[PDB]
Design a protein around this ligand. Structure first.
Ligand SMILES: O=C1NC[C@H](CO)[C@@H](O)[C@@H]1O
Ligand SMILES: [Br-]
Ligand SMILES: [Br-]
Ligand SMILES: [Br-]
Ligand SMILES: [Br-]
Ligand SMILES: [Br-]
Ligand SMILES: [Cl-]
Ligand SMILES: [Cl-]
Ligand SMILES: [Cl-]
Ligand SMILES: [Cl-]
Ligand SMILES: [Cl-]
Ligand SMILES: [Cl-]
Length: 836
């Protein structure tokens, strides 16, 4: 791209527990815990009872060192920068006897001019990582109260003093692994004249006819003379130039601000997943001096995103308008993919986005107890058409608000805003998760003096109502900011539900039935959720067979919700027969979470436009654990993820039964209206015999972006109470010429009340490298079938579905570990098998 040379400092590192003088090979980027694990100096932290056994690490200081060679020629370049994309967290950086930096914020990248400190030949880099526990003990002692951060799993809630990923201190689905290290890459750049410090592509306006952009460059010139230069911006699409602009300047020593307008006529818009292609242009900025001394590019999506948050007849709306069209949000809350962040590989990020795209999602919330994610995450969101709701990294406790603390926060806000603001995917900023809710409703006023409580309330405003919104206004002026989620609505207070976004924890924490999701509607659901144990192959990863009990010491290790096991059983009993065996209980628990949650996803879509989105808690897991996730740590889809896919389908037939009556809604997130449609239904018993006749509803239209009721019928006079326990309703939607565009099945009774027949699911299999193809058959209904295989992360065309009587079903399973001539073990489970 330019004349600079980059040296990756990613080999030859060593580490030491401070004070031991013993050094061993390390892997950078990485973590202290991983380095110890790689030397068998820690047990597998995710196995068994090992959490307590690895806590000692957090009390030690840890040192890292590397050496590297610099040549006479490199030392003669105009400038040389050492760049740390991430240091976790209190890190003193020494090079060649100079203290370069005292780092104090995990979320900040540092760029350090070092030419004057480098030497020809060998150069020595040492980094000292202070324990973030020891570092903040004096700070806590001076504070005179303990912040109410219940998720910080220690007597002393030290997390709040450090700009370090909150979840690292523990969470209610998380292991405590308060780690340290060089967590993102370290690079040396040797260059001439200048670097581009920042390149911002600011969209001024966008119409079907024209996109107007402002290319804003910050150029840091390292030489003392004045340097004539030409700044060039090339805009290309698929390798073909669309427009090119240039500007003559004379670069002054230090910072230069350069602005170049560019326009794209008849722009091809970036669309979100479901509404078209996520088209990305390539914008390249170069600085040319007589040689291209500096270049930087971004992929750019041309679209408008407006968050509409306005007083209205129902309270206060909260929805996303994309390219001028209101878009119903369908997605999930994302947490960190690992207890050890550098262990998350490119392939894991790619697979997680494939999981979101395949489940018909169009939005992800990067929840405030994790990290501002790596550039790759947002690059994947851009190319998959997934909108990103970005929390700042504050969650579930008030935080300090003293000048030094706020200076750290300002540093991370500026850094990460400039880092992320060029992504098409980035849709909004949110100051924190649940802090105002906590301050108002979680009973802190009983835990603190009135004076300390007042201090907390004032401190909330300084950070979330002043500093963060001001920073967004300055650096990302056309993106929405809200101070907290949920900003006003509280789940126990019905009068607040028509006001902005909800975290409806009435289900789960409030013990409310899943049916409450049909009546208790938000303007936008930013969280709701339900736990499940992950499937047996995941349990087997952390537990020996002796430990396969809900309440074994090892299982309780991997359940961080102290009320979770009791809630799961309570809810299961409402709808299912509780199985006697642990393995069957796990299977039904997956079914339960899937069925209950999808009932909610369907209510939210059905109630558009009153409700304009749903983001369930939670997408994913950081380690093998019992949690609210739809995908376990090993990437296995739980039932919930298949159910989410189905409930988020662009066109959905939603039968909803209440008060002994059935309505059927047709729900569409398509941009086009469907005309002359037929809804066809029929009642089929569990033996496959049709009851009565086919019901047909002709001449239906399904307008773009609407939910509409097309059919209502009382059950009384149609089906006997006996019919209701022994049959299901099949529903199909077809176009004028008879082609199927959607299908659904409906049960008229709770599963535990169904008279399911004993039945065998037989299968045929054709296995080749990487692939099994199964054909399943049962002469009778098999309810909520789970096709279980021992291969971690195996992918299925479908799973957790009802196998209908006499209706053959093909299922493809893929995994790089499937070998032709090593038959894939397959175990098919279904509800009736779970009891006698
Ligand atoms: O934002 C949140 N809401 C509820 C989750 C489960 O208790 C919790 O893990 C998360 O902090
Ligand atoms: Br320099
Ligand atoms: Br220090
Ligand atoms: Br300037
Ligand atoms: Br969509
Ligand atoms: Br605000
Ligand atoms: Cl610099
Ligand atoms: Cl408002
Ligand atoms: Cl107090
Ligand atoms: Cl229903
Ligand atoms: Cl009913
Ligand atoms: Cl059976």
């Amino acid at each position: 791209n330019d004349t600079s040379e980059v040296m990756l400092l990613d080999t030859g590192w060593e580490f030491s527990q401070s004070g031991t003088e013993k050094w061993m090979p390390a892997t950078v980027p990485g973590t202290v815990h991983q380095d110890l694990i790689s030397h068998e100096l820690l047990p597998n932290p995710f196995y068994g009872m090992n959490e307590k056994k690895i806590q000692w690490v957090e009390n030690e200081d840890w040192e890292y060192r590397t050496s590297f060679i610099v040549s006479e020629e490199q030392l003669n370049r105009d400038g040389i920068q050492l760049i740390f994309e991430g240091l976790d967290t209190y890190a003193d950086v020494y090079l060649n006897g100079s203290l370069l930096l005292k780092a104090d914020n995990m979320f900040v990248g540092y760029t350090l001019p070092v030419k004057s400190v480098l030497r020809k030949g060998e150069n020595h880099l040492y980094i000292y990582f202070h324990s973030p526990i020891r570092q903040t003990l004096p700070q806590y002692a001076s504070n005179g109260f303990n912040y109410p951060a219940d998720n910080d799993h220690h007597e002393k809630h030290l997390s709040v003093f450090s700009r370090k990923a909150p979840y690292s201190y523990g969470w209610d689905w998380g292991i405590r692994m308060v780690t340290s290290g060089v967590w993102r890459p370290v690079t040396l750049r040797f260059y001439d004249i200048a670097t581009i410090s920042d390149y911002y592509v600011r969209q001024l306006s966008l119409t079907d006819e024209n996109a107007r952009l402002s290319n804003e460059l910050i150029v840091n010139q390292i030489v003392p003379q004045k340097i004539p230069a030409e700044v060039r911006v090339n805009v290309s699409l698929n390798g073909t130039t669309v427009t090119e602009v240039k500007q003559q300047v004379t670069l002054q020593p230090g910072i230069n601000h350069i602005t170049l307008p560019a326009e794209v006529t008849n722009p091809v818009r970036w669309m979100p997943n479901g509404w078209g292609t996520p088209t990305l242009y390539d914008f390249s900025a170069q600085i040319a001096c007589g040689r291209i001394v500096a270049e930087q590019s971004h992929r750019i999506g041309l679209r408008t995103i407006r968050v509409v948050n306005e007083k209205d007849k129902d309270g206060e709306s909260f929805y996303f308008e994309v390219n001028g069209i209101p878009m119903f949000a369908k997605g999930a809350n994302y947490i960190p993919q690992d207890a050890l962040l550098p262990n998350v590989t490119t392939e894991r990020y790619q697979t997680l986005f494939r999981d979101m795209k395949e489940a018909n999602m169009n939005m992800v919330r990067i929840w405030g107890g994790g990290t501002y994610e790596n550039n790759l995450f947002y690059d994947l969101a851009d190319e998959n058409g997934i909108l990103v709701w970005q929390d700042f990294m504050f969650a579930c406790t008030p935080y300090p608000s003293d000048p030094t603390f706020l200076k750290r926060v300002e540093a991370e806000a500026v850094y990460n805003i400039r880092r992320l603001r060029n992504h098409a995917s980035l849709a909004m900023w949110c100051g924190n998760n649940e802090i105002l809710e906590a301050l108002k409703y979680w009973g802190f006023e009983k835990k603190f003096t009135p004076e300390v409580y007042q201090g907390l309330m004032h401190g909330y405003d300084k950070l979330f109502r002043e500093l963060l919104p001001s920073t967004v206004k300055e650096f990302d002026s056309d993106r929405f900011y809200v101070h907290s989620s949920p900003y006003l609505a509280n789940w126990g207070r019905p009068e607040s539900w028509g006001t902005g976004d909800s975290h409806n924890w009435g289900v789960w924490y409030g013990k409310k039935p899943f049916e409450s999701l049909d009546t208790d509607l938000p303007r936008f659901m930013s969280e709701f959720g339900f736990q499940s144990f992950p499937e047996m192959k995941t349990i087997a990863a952390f537990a020996a067979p002796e430990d396969y009990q809900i309440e074994s010491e090892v299982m309780n290790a991997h359940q961080k919700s102290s009320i979770g096991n009791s809630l799961i059983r309570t809810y299961m009993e409402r709808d299912y027969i509780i199985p006697e065996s642990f393995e069957d209980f796990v299977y039904v628990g997956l079914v339960l979470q899937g069925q209950g949650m999808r009932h909610g996803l369907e209510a939210h879509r059905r109630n558009r436009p009153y409700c304009m989105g749903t983001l369930y808690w939670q997408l994913n897991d950081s380690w093998p654990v019992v949690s609210w996730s739809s995908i376990d740590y090993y990437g296995n889809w739980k039932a919930l993820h298949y159910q989410a896919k189905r409930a988020f389908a662009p066109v959905l037939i939603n039968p909803i039964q209440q008060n002994d009556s059935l309505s059927v809604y047709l729900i569409s997130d398509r941009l086009d209206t469907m005309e002359q449609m037929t809804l066809e239904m029929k009642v089929v018993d569990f033996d496959g015999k049709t009851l009565g006749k086919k019901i047909q509803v002709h001449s239906l239209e399904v307008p773009a972006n609407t939910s509409k009721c097309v059919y209502r019928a009382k059950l009384d006079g149609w089906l006997t109470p006996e019919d209701c326990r022994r049959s299901f309703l099949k529903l199909i939607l077809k176009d004028k010429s008879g082609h199927q565009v959607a299908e659904s099945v409906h049960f008229f009774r709770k599963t535990k009340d169904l008279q399911l027949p004993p039945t065998s699911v037989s299968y045929q299999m054709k296995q080749t490298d990487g692939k099994c193809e199964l054909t399943l058959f049962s002469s009778m209904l098999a309810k909520d079938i789970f096709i279980e295989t021992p291969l971690q992360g195996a992918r299925y065309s479908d799973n957790f579905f009802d196998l209908l009587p006499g209706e053959r079903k093909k299922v493809i399973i893929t995994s790089p570990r499937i070998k032709k001539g090593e038959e894939l073990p397959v175990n098919i489970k279904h509800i009736r098998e779970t009891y006698k």
